[PDB]
Every structure is written in structure tokens, then in C-alpha cells.
Amino acid sequence: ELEEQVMHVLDQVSELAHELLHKLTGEELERAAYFNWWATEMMLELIKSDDEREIREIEEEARRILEHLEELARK
Amino acid sequence: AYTNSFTRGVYYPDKVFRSSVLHSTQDLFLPFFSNVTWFHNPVLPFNDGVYFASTEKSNIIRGWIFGTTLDSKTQSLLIVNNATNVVIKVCEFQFCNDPFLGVNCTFEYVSFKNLREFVFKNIDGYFKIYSKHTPINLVRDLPQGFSALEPLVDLPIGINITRFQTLLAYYVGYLQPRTFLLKYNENGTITDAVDCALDPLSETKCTLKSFTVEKGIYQTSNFRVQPTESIVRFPNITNLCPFGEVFNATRFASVYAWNRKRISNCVADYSVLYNSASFSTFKCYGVSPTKLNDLCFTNVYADSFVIRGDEVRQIAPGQTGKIADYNYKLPDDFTGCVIAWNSNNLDSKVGGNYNYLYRLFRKSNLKPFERDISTEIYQAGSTPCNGVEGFNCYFPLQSYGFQPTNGVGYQPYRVVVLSFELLHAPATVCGPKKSTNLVKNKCVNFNFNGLTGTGVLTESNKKFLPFQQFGRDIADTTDAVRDPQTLEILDITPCSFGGVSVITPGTNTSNQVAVLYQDVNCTEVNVFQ
Amino acid sequence: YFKIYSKHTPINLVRDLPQGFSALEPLVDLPIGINITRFQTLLAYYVGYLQPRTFLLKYNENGTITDAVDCALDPLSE
Ligand SMILES: *[C@@H]1O[C@H](CO)[C@@H](O)[C@H](O)[C@H]1NC(C)=O
Ligand SMILES: *[C@@H]1O[C@H](CO)[C@@H](O)[C@H](O)[C@H]1NC(C)=O
Ligand SMILES: *[C@@H]1O[C@H](CO)[C@@H](O)[C@H](O)[C@H]1NC(C)=O
Ligand SMILES: *[C@@H]1O[C@H](CO)[C@@H](O)[C@H](O)[C@H]1NC(C)=O
Ligand SMILES: *[C@@H]1O[C@H](CO)[C@@H](O)[C@H](O)[C@H]1NC(C)=O
Ligand SMILES: *[C@@H]1O[C@H](CO)[C@@H](O)[C@H](O)[C@H]1NC(C)=O
Ligand SMILES: *[C@@H]1O[C@H](CO)[C@@H](O)[C@H](O)[C@H]1NC(C)=O
Ligand SMILES: *[C@@H]1O[C@H](CO)[C@@H](O)[C@H](O)[C@H]1NC(C)=O
Ligand SMILES: *[C@@H]1O[C@H](CO)[C@@H](O)[C@H](O)[C@H]1NC(C)=O
Ligand SMILES: *[C@@H]1O[C@H](CO)[C@@H](O)[C@H](O)[C@H]1NC(C)=O
Ligand SMILES: *[C@@H]1O[C@H](CO)[C@@H](O)[C@H](O)[C@H]1NC(C)=O
């Protein structure tokens, strides 16, 4: 179930980043696009991987990114 | 136990004075010589009104209950004659399992040797009671003779009555639509009556508006043979729309490049897909899944693609998201059906199937049914990409990772959207037209490839040309049709009809009559042809 | 609906059309919904044009058309 939990967080990052593509401008827009790409890249990287430690590393970075994006969403 | 109603159950239909006149009227009456049930005490149906009569020596029958549920759930009408005045109430009464008398309300009103007759009917909310009380000398039957019942009570209640019960021998009959000829005397009373549907002689009397008929032959009504079943026939289905090339396809397109197949000029059977029960999603917009099969269209468009299970929700009117905005957009006034099923054991690969892609980045959102298969590098920043992926530059597409172990939201689904339109065109895409068998030598209704009518279908000896479907008479009416499945020619003969005349010696000679059925085979009606 | 009627008969005639009566049968009916204002023949032939006219058609015992009157041709036909 760990992989699904991580995919969930990545989905939250991508979906929020997607909405921001129609809201943000300038550098903030570029960042949302970057994070959007990253989240989907992790989805595939997670599938093609093993070792809980690598899976957890994605989970943590994805959570940090989600929190970051919320700072833009509220602006 | 049953008895003979004779000529009982006649009442004054209104409050109009008439004298020395024969008046024809249509109302609910007790048919002459009908079967009346003889009771010596269950709940009975009310139907369209009931005829009640009783024979008495010592006032055993006290009243009646009328209503529906009769169990303190709904209002009911209680009529009881206790010692002196009659008491009538309408309330939510609680009745016993076997109500009798010893020795929330909206309405209240207070008023063998003995024969008492009553008519109980409810018209437009008005409960109307007619009655008559006469002396008799009769123990085990009803008297034979004529009398009319007068109106006594009219209660403006507005209460539904379907059942009733008698409260304590008595007889119960039922009223129905009948036509009567009523004879009024000099004193304005009714002295006789004819039941116009009792027999040919009575019918003749009503037709001539007289209780006396002289010698001669008279026309009364018409005879007509009625049709039974309906024979509907259509040409063989022949072909079917290539839906098997869409749903059972070996390869599906990527969502960013969905594959549209045009279906037209064919029979579109939608019942097969509907009842396959192999789909996780089957949502129709603008049409019902069980009515779609009977609709005709100019074009059917089948858009096929593969997406993730979670993305299925985006394939609908009024949706947004990565697919709805950048890959496959539906209009808000969309007409068609969205069908999807799980393909995890087909499209998934061990290690992940990365041959499917979706659009991740786009400058703007797609229009309805628009596609974009460009691979131009997307600029995320302010710095130009010049066709080169890198910092602040992305390839517009991203791959899926479908593997057997993915959660259901991340399992692949094959989606087919059937979009419908109708233009100025004939609209050649219709579902199958079901047909029945052929019945000959009987009066039937029919529909032959759109040609409707009624009559008896028989085998013909006629010749139609290879391109002709039906024939006509000099009257321009249809007299023959071609069978759309068998290619035989049938003749159409109208179902027999004609006038009926009654032959009588006159009512001062005999009540025996003979009946003539005009221009008809006796085989269809001593019988003399 | 693009409707095509046709007839194929044997002739012995080089520089004209035969004089006699025959009727053409329906062969094809195409539910297209297409506007047609011009046409061309792909490879001698003759071209005439149709217009609203009233005809009296004579049918025989075998359901075929054996004759016809053009009601606007002249006073006798009328
Ligand atoms: C009506 O009553 C007669 C007896 O007088 C009986 O023979 C007949 O069968 C009854 N009809 C019905 C429908 O009960
Ligand atoms: C009949 O019943 C009513 C109640 O419904 C009662 O008021 C009336 O007095 C009774 N009649 C006699 C004679 O007791
Ligand atoms: C009492 O009877 C009336 C009938 O008009 C009904 O509308 C009303 O709801 C009834 N009261 C209750 C508590 O059911
Ligand atoms: C009787 O019930 C029917 C519904 O079955 C209703 O339409 C009708 O108005 C009712 N009549 C009265 C008098 O309540
Ligand atoms: C009732 O009719 C009779 C004739 O049958 C007539 O003599 C009598 O006067 C009538 N009754 C009245 C009040 O006129
Ligand atoms: C697809 O194949 C299945 C299995 O033979 C069949 O039941 C179904 O009707 C087919 N669907 C279509 C559109 O032919
Ligand atoms: C329709 O199918 C039946 C067999 O079920 C065949 O006998 C009949 O000739 C067919 N009719 C046409 C017009 O194809
Ligand atoms: C019936 O005919 C006889 C003649 O034979 C006549 O005296 C009698 O009055 C007639 N009855 C009626 C009602 O016409
Ligand atoms: C009555 O039916 C028989 C059997 O079909 C037929 O021979 C006879 O001619 C018919 N009578 C009339 C008047 O058509
Ligand atoms: C032909 O063109 C006219 C416009 O001049 C249009 O109104 C009509 O509907 C068209 N018919 C077809 C079959 O396209
Ligand atoms: C065609 O008409 C002729 C008479 O001119 C007739 O003898 C022939 O039988 C008809 N053809 C058929 C199949 O009946």
C-alpha cells in the first residue's frame, strides 16, 4: 500500500500544479510547471524502483513540494 | 346463491318533471335480468356504484360502511339508522373485525313484509342515495314488477369509496353504463322502462322511441368484426454497424491522439453493448440507454483512447483536468454515451507499459473534440527553448506507467465515446426493427414496412414488379402488400361489417323476432344464408 | 435522395433515337443530402431536362406502363 500512498501525494502535487498553470505568471508559473513535471516523473520513477528508503525519499520530497505549491495557490 | 334482478334498480335520474313522454337517457343502472348475489357478511367491492336491497320483518339491518382502507388510516362514511333519525358521519373510524350493533371528522348529518331498496353511487364527490319502501308477501325471492326509486340524500363529501359492508337477508347487484327508455305517466312518475341492450326487440323499441312496435323490418345498429393481434413485419436486418472494430480492437490510441472512427449507413444495435455488463462505466447524455436503440442519426463517432482509471471521471460534460483540458475535451451540450472498461490484464506490462502518452503541457485549453499531436517543446519560463528541451523547457508529452500491480486508480482503462449528430441528411443510422410472424385468414391489425392498416390478410394470385412494394385499387386504397421478408404478395380484404335489422310481426302479435345481418357470411356472425 | 431510374433495350439505329414507348424502372436510391448543380459524363450521348408536367399513365394487366399522355402537349392530349 506504500506505493499507492506515495502516488496519492504525487497526484496532489500534479493536480494543484495543473490548476496553477492557469493562475500564476512569471517565475511562479515556471515553478508550478516544474513541480507538475516532477510529480509525474516521480510516478514513473517510483514504478521502476525498489527499496523502501528510495520510496520514502520520494514521499518526503513530494510532501515538501505540495506544501510549497500551496503558498502560491493562496496568493 | 343468486337471484333474478328482473326490472329492479330503476331510479329517477334527475329532478326534472316530465309527463306523458318517453325519455331516453344514459346513466349507471342495474341491467335487466342480471345475476344478483344473495347474502344471509363479508366486505364487498363498490365498483362504479352498488344496488342494495333487503327483505325484513324486524329491522335487523341498521346501516352501511363505505370507504377504502376502513382501518383508522383514512376517512370513511358511516351511515347508521339507530331507533329514530339516521346519523351520517365521515371520520377516520376504527372498525371491528366483525362490526355490529346491539339493542378526526369532517362531516356530520342527521335526518317477509318489508322490502327496502337503495342505490348508492358516488359522482364527482357527491354520494347520492336513492330509495324505495314497498310492502311484500314473499319469503325466498325478489318480487317481479316495476317501480322507480326516488332521491333521498345527496352528500357533498369528496370521499373515495372502493369497498363497503352491511351493518346488522339482503341482495347486492352492481351498476354499469346502460341506455334506458323511461316511460312517464300523466302524474310525472315512471311506470315502465326498456333496457336497450337486453335483446334485439328491446333495442328496436329504443331505436323507434316507443314501447309499441308495429309489423315490419327495422334497422337498429351495426355489426362489425374486430381485429385481434397486430402483425408487424420488416425486411431482414442484413447488416450491423462495425462496433466490434471499436470495442474489441487489438490496439488503442494514446489519449493525446485519440482515434475517431466514423460509423454510418448501417444498423446500430445498442442493446448488445448495454446488456454486455462488461463495462465499469456506461453513462449517456442527451439520450437514454434504453431509448437510444430506437433513435436515428446522421453520424456516429467512436472516439477511442487509453487513460488511467482515476482519469475516467474527466470524460464527461463540464469537466476540467489534465485530460479534459489538454487531451480530450467534451462540450457541455454533448450528446452521446461514454463507455469504459478495465484492461489491466491486456494493456499492462511487467515493469510498466510506457508506450502510452498524454499531453502534460499546453499554452491553452482544447476546444470540444479538438486534437493536438504536436511535439513542440513547451516553454515554462521566459527563456526561449528553440526546439530544445532543458532548463525551463519540457517535452509536451509524458508517458504512462501501466503495470499489473498498479492500484485500480492507476490501472489502464479503455474508453470509447459514441458521439451523435443529426443534420439535414436522411439520417441513415437507425437501430434494428423487430418483427413478428405472419397471420393469415384472420381479422388483424398490421404494419408492413411502414404501411399500416387493418383487415384480413390472404394469399394472392397477383404479380408485383421487382421494385413494387404494395398495390392500390381504383379508389386509391391499398388492396395488396408485399411481405418484406418472404417476398410473397398478400391481398387485403376489409373486415366484415354491415347493418343489423330486426324483423317483427308487431308487439301485439308476438315478442318473437328474427335478426338479419346484412351482406355477411353466416360463418362469421335456425340459420339461413 | 439521389434517385436513379434506368432501362436497357436492343436497337438497330445509328444516327438517331428510336420512336416508341417504354418506361424506366428505379434502380438506385442514395440518401446522400448532396447539392448538385452541374454534372459531367466520363468516357455519343443525349441530354434532356426534366420539368413539372402532368401525365396520364396507362397500366396493363401485368402492372407495367404501356402508354402515356403528356397533358400539356396540345388540345387533344389535354
Ligand atoms: C345467473 O342465475 C342463473 C339462475 O337463475 C344461473 O343459471 C346462471 O348461471 C347465473 N349466471 C351467473 C353468471 O352466475
Ligand atoms: C343515535 O346515535 C346518535 C349518535 O350517533 C345519538 O346522538 C342519538 O341520540 C341516537 N338516537 C337515539 C334514539 O338514541
Ligand atoms: C384530519 O383529517 C384531515 C382531512 O381533511 C387531514 O387533512 C388531516 O391531516 C387529519 N389530521 C391528522 C393529524 O392526520
Ligand atoms: C381517489 O384516489 C385517486 C388516486 O387513485 C385520486 O386521483 C382521486 O382524486 C381520489 N378521489 C377522491 C374523492 O379522493
Ligand atoms: C294520478 O293519476 C290519476 C290517473 O291515473 C289521476 O286521476 C290523479 O288525479 C293523479 N293524481 C293527482 C294528484 O292528480
Ligand atoms: C466483443 O467480444 C465479446 C466476446 O466475443 C462479445 O460478447 C461482444 O459482444 C463484442 N462486442 C462487440 C461490439 O462486438
Ligand atoms: C430473411 O431470412 C430468412 C431466414 O431466416 C430467409 O429465409 C429469407 O429469405 C430472408 N429474406 C430476405 C429478404 O433476405
Ligand atoms: C291487438 O289486435 C287486436 C285485433 O286483433 C285489437 O283488438 C287490440 O286492441 C290490439 N292491441 C293493441 C295494443 O294494439
Ligand atoms: C359463406 O361461407 C362459405 C364458406 O366459406 C361460402 O361458400 C359461402 O359462399 C359464403 N356465403 C356468402 C354469401 O358469401
Ligand atoms: C444547397 O444549398 C442551399 C444554399 O444555396 C442550402 O440552403 C441547401 O440546404 C443545400 N442543400 C443541400 C442538400 O446541401
Ligand atoms: C403478361 O401479360 C400477358 C398478356 O398480354 C399474360 O398472358 C402473361 O401471363 C402476363 N405475365 C404473367 C407472368 O402473368
Residue numbers in the entry:
A (entry chain K): 1 to 75
B (entry chain A): 27 to 66, 81 to 143, 165 to 172, 186 to 242, 264 to 620, 641 to 644
C (entry chain D): 200 to 242, 264 to 298
Direct quotes from the study:
As an alternative to mAbs, we previously computationally designed two classes of minibinder proteins that block the SARS-CoV-2 receptor binding domain (RBD) interaction with its host receptor, angiotensin converting enzyme 2 (ACE2). Here, we sought to develop constructs containing three minibinder domains that could simultaneously engage all three RBDs on a single S protein, and by virtue of this multivalent binding, potently neutralize SARS-CoV-2 variants. The second consists of self-assembling homotrimers of minibinders geometrically matched to the 3 RBDs on a single spike; although AHB2 is lower affinity than LCB1 and LCB3, and the sites targeted are less diverse than the first class, homotrimers of AHB2 have the advantage that the ACE2 binding site is inherently less mutable as the virus must bind ACE2 to infect cells.
We also hypothesized that constructs with binding domains containing different sets of contacts with the target epitope could prevent escape. To design multivalent constructs, we started from optimized versions of the previously described LCB1, AHB2, and LCB3 minibinders (hereafter referred to as monomers MON1, MON2, and MON3, respectively). We selected two trimeric scaffolds, the designed two ring helical bundle SB175 (domain 2) and the T4 foldon (domain 1), to proceed with based on the screening results and previous experience with these scaffolds. We next determined how the designed multivalent proteins engage multiple RBDs on a single S trimer; multivalent engagement on a virion typically requires binding of a single S trimer due to the relatively sparse S distribution. To determine the binding modes of these compounds to the S trimer and characterize the structure of the MON2 and RBD interactions at high resolution, we carried out cryogenic electron microscopy (cryoEM) characterization of these complexes. Strikingly, the TRI2 designs showed little dissociation after 24 hours against any of the tested S trimer mutants. The TRI2 proteins maintained potent neutralization across all tested variants, notably including the B.1.1.7, Wash-B.1.351, Wash-P.1, B.1.617.2, and B.1.1.529 variants. Impressively, the TRI2 proteins potently neutralized the B.1.1.529 variant whereas many clinical mAbs for the treatment of COVID-19 do not. The TRI2 proteins maintained the strongest binding across all S trimer variants tested, likely because MON2 is an ACE2 mimic, similar to the recently reported S2K146 mAb. This combination of trivalency and receptor mimicry could be a useful general approach for combating viral escape and antigenic drift. To determine whether the multivalent minibinders can prevent or treat SARS-CoV-2 infection in vivo, we performed pre-exposure prophylaxis or post-exposure therapy studies in highly susceptible K18-hACE2 transgenic mice with TRI2 multivalent minibinders, which retained the most consistent binding to all S trimer variants tested.
